[PDB]
Each structure stands twice: as structure tokens, then as C-alpha cells.
């Protein structure tokens, strides 16, 4: 009865809303095991990953920046992409990295 | 062209494949609308 009271209570305290907000953080889905991502790998999953972007169309705001996004990474000279993995050590200013 | 975009060339070849297949998905928009249009259609741009 007092869960019961409450609720009234609260409803009516409240506005109502339809649109259960966000809770997952960052979203994300495995079928397999997970290998710990290095540098190499990291490299190489950027690459397949713009290729799969590049493949969908959008239709959000947020969608065409990733596209965007992933076309410019797509397009990045062998130098850049050179310096974009590189440590501060041996990395030197570039055009876009 | 994305999956050309992951391979590695070895052959000169192999590096003409890859480099076209970049040529190709760096097309733009209206590149790519007359790319597959029709003579009837089709109007000149600055790649296609």
C-alpha cells in the first residue's frame, strides 16, 4: 500500500514522459573473444572499419559526420598515417596528423 | 574499392589496382551520379 501511495504520489508530482532516457554509456556487442588491441591491430581495424563505413548510407545528422569521418581517415597520405601511429619520439609535424 | 582498401600491394600491378580503387572512392557525389547516368543525362564534370 505505501509503494502503492508513493507512486501515485510521485506521478503526480512529476510531468510524465514517454522517452526512457539513455543509460548504456557506450554501446557495444562482441560474439567472440576479445584480443587486447594493439597498435598493429589498432591500425588494421581502422582501416576495415572505414572500408564498412564507407559501404553504409546515412540518414542522421550524426550518421553523415561519421561518414564524413571515415572518409577522411580513408584519405590520409602514408605519411600521415605513419606520424598518426607514431610515439612523440620519433613523430614529426604533419600537413593533417 | 573497400575491400582492395585493406590489402597490401606487392606488385606494381598491385599498386595500380590499389591506386585506382582509391581514385574511385574519393569520387564525389555529382562524380558519381553522372558516373552511372545516362548520355541523356549525363553532363561534364572535373573527374567523370
Given at each position: 500500500e505505501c509503494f502503492n501511495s508513493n507512486e501515485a504520489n510521485h506521478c503526480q508530482r512529476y510531468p510524465m514522459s514517454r522517452k526512457?532516457?539513455?543509460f548504456?554509456?557506450?554501446?557495444?556487442?562482441?560474439?567472440?573473444?576479445?584480443?587486447?588491441?594493439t597498435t598493429?591491430?589498432?591500425?588494421?581495424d581502422s582501416?576495415?572499419?572505414?572500408?564498412?563505413?564507407?559501404?553504409?548510407?546515412?540518414?542522421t545528422p550524426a550518421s553523415y559526420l561519421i561518414h564524413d569521418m571515415a572518409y577522411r581517415y580513408?584519405?590520409?597520405?602514408?605519411e600521415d598515417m605513419i606520424?598518426?601511429?607514431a610515439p612523440r619520439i620519433?613523430?614529426?609535424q604533419t600537413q593533417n596528423v
Open positions: 526512457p532516457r539513455n548504456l554509456l557506450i554501446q557495444c556487442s562482441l560474439i567472440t573473444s576479445y584480443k587486447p588491441a598493429l591491430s589498432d591500425q588494421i582501416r576495415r572499419a572505414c572500408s564498412y563505413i564507407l559501404n553504409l548510407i546515412p540518414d580513408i584519405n590520409l597520405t602514408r606520424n598518426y601511429y620519433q613523430f614529426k
